[PDB]
C-alpha cells in the first residue's frame, strides 16, 4: 500500500477533500464518457 | 476520456461478483475516488449487460450529497471502470453489527437523510427498491450515502410487477403479487427504521413463508425499549395500504427525526 492510501496520510487527504471540494460537474462530468451502447464493444 | 493509468492504485477496498473496488487517486487532481472495475467477459458470461447499463444510467444521473457519486466511467480492452464517490467511513452494515442497534440520534439523521435522498429520486420517477443497511454507505461525518441501485427503476407511468428486494425488507404489494409504485421505498424505509433501533427487523422469522405471513399481517411487535415517538413514525411507514404511508416529505417533517436528527450538509463547490 503506497503512502497516501494509509494512516494519517490518507485520514489528511480526505480531511481536505471533505472541507475543500472541487468542481466534479466540471472536473468530471464535462469530460467524454463511453456511450453505453459502447461498453461491451470496441475500446 | 479517461484510462486506468490515469489513477494511482491504493488498496483494494471490497470484492464482488464481477469485480473489485479500490481506493485510487486521480492523477492530476490528486482527488481520492473509488474504482469498480468490472470485468467485460464476465459481465457477458452471466448474461447481466443491460442489468448493468440501466445501473450506470440510473446512479450517473443523480446528484445528492446522500447518494453516492458516480463521477463519471471508462473502458478499455477486458474491463469496464466505475468512478465512484470514496466514502470514508465504509458500510453502514459493519457499524451496525458492530454497535448491535443504534441509537436515537444516530437513527433519526440517518432517517433524515435517506428520507431527502429518496425524495430526490421520486421527483426523477426513480424507485430504489432495495433499501436496506447493505446497500448503505457512510461519508467523512457519518453521513448516509445510497450505495447500490442494483433493484432500481426508472418508473415514469407505468406501475411495477417485478418481485425484488430481500426478504426482510419486502412490502405486503410485492408478497401478493400485485402491482408496485414508488411507495415500496416508503415501506422499506420503515424497515430500515426499526432495525437500525432494534438491531433486527420487524418481521424476523426461521422460515420464508413465516416472514411472508408476518409482512401481510404487519405483525408489528415494538420492543419496550423504543421511544413513543420512533414507534410513531415506525408505524406510520408500515401501513399495510401503499397510499396511507407516511410521505418522505411527513418523514423528514415527523417531530421525531426533528427532535433528534442531527443532520449536517458536506460543504459544496464553491464558486
Ligand atoms: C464503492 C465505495 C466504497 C467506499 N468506501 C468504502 C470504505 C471502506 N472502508 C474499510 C473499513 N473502514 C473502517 C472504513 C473504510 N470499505 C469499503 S468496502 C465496499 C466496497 C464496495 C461498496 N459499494 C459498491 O460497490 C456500490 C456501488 C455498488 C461499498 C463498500 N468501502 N466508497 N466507495
Redesign the interface.
Known amino acids: ?2 503512502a ?3 494512516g494519517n496520510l ?1 485520514t489528511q ?3 481536505q ?9 466540471r ?3 464535462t ?4 456511450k ?1 451502447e459502447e ?2 464493444n470496441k ?1 | 476520456k479517461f484510462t486506468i493509468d490515469d489513477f494511482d492504485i491504493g488498496r483494494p477496498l471490497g470484492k464482488g461478483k464481477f469485480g473489485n473496488v479500490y481506493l485510487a487517486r486521480e492523477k492530476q487532481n490528486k482527488f481520492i475516488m473509488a474504482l469498480k472495475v468490472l470485468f467485460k467477459s464476465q459481465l457477458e458470461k452471466e448474461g447481466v449487460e443491460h442489468q448493468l447499463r440501466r445501473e450506470i444510467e440510473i446512479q450517473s444521473h443523480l446528484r445528492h450529497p446522500n447518494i453516492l457519486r458516480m463521477y463519471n466511467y471508462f473502458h478499455d480492452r477486458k474491463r469496464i471502470y466505475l468512478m465512484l464517490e470514496f466514502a470514508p467511513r465504509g458500510e453502514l452494515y459493519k457499524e451496525l453489527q458492530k454497535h448491535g442497534r443504534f441509537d436515537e440520534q444516530r437513527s433519526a439523521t440517518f432517517m433524515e437523510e435517506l428520507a431527502d435522498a429518496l425524495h430526490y429520486c421520486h421527483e426523477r420517477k426513480v424507485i430504489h427498491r432495495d433499501i436496506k443497511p447493505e446497500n448503505l454507505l457512510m461519508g467523512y461525518k457519518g453521513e448516509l450515502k445510497i450505495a447500490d441501485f442494483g433493484w432500481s427503476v426508472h418508473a415514469p407511468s407505468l406501475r411495477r410487477r417485478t418481485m425484488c428486494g430481500t426478504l426482510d425488507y419486502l412490502p405486503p404489494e410485492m408478497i401478493e403479487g400485485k402491482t408496485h409504485d414508488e411507495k415500496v421505498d416508503l415501506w422499506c424505509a420503515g424497515v430500515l427504521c426499526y432495525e437500525f433501533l432494534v438491531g433486527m427487523p420487524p418481521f424476523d422469522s426461521p422460515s420464508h413463508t413465516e416472514t411472508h405471513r408476518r409482512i401481510v399481517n404487519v405483525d408489528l411487535k415494538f420492543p419496550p425499549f423504543l421511544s413513543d415517538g420512533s414507534k410513531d413514525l415506525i408505524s406510520k411507514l408500515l401501513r399495510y395500504h401503499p397510499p396511507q404511508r407516511l410521505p418522505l416529505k411527513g418523514v423528514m417533517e415527523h417531530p421525531w427525526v426533528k427532535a433528534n436528527s442531527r443532520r449536517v450538509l458536506p460543504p459544496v463547490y464553491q464558486s
Do not use: E, H, N, T
Open positions: 500500500i503506497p497516501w492510501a494509509s490518507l487527504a480526505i480531511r477533500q471533505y472541507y475543500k471540494p472541487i468542481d466534479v460537474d472536473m468530471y462530468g469530460i467524454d464518457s463511453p453505453l461498453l461491451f475500446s
